[PDB]
Amino acid sequence: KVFGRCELAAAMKRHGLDNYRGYSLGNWVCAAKFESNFNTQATNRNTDGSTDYGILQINSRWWCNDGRTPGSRNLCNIPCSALLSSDITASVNCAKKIVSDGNGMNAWVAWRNRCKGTDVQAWIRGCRL
């Protein structure tokens, strides 16, 4: 599924991400825009054998099991295919686990490069949340 910007903001709101571990809602919407262009089916296959899955491009080396990633752990306790659903719940529940892992949202390369430092409230303009 592809989300619209405000549609995704609403969905993330309802999953309690606003101010989750100190990160306002705009952060998460911005992250999703630049990681996956709002696409729940996005995949990116890397040179280390890992794959980034779903709307927040969660990586298979640490966080999910896809059966084909070298030296893999499964800290979200889920198959990676669960992150490819039109339902963002699994992605949100695993993202919560990741942002609490000590380096906040710098776990997302697109956030740290494209969102960090900017006025992220703009991502929820016009949404009427």
Q: Supply the residues annotated as catalytic.
A: 35, 52
Decide: residue 103, CB within 10 A, 0-12 exposed, 13-18 middle, 19+ buried. Answer: exposed
On whether 18 is known to bind a ligand per the annotation, the reply is: no
Residue 65 touches Cl ion, criterion: CB under 5 A = yes
Which region, judged by CB under 5 A, interacts with Na ion, from 15-23, 26-34, 70-78, 113-121? Answer: 70-78
CA separation for the pair 127, 73 (Å, rounded) = 38
Residue 72 touches Na ion, criterion: CB under 5 A = yes
Query: Using CB under 5 A, which residues numbered 69 to 98 contact Cl ion?
Result: 69, 72
CA separation for the pair 73, 84 (Å, rounded) = 19
List the single partner that 57 binds among Cl ion, Na ion, none, CB under 5 to 8 Å by kind: none
Contact between 57 and 35 under an 8 Å Cβ cutoff? The reply is yes
Residue 60 touches Na ion, criterion: CB under 5 A = yes
CB-nearer residue toward Na ion: 37 or 77: 77
Closest CA to 95 of 51, 46, 55, 48: 55
Residue 51 touches Na ion, criterion: CB under 5 A = no
Residues near Na ion, by CB under 5 A:
60, 65, 69, 72, 74
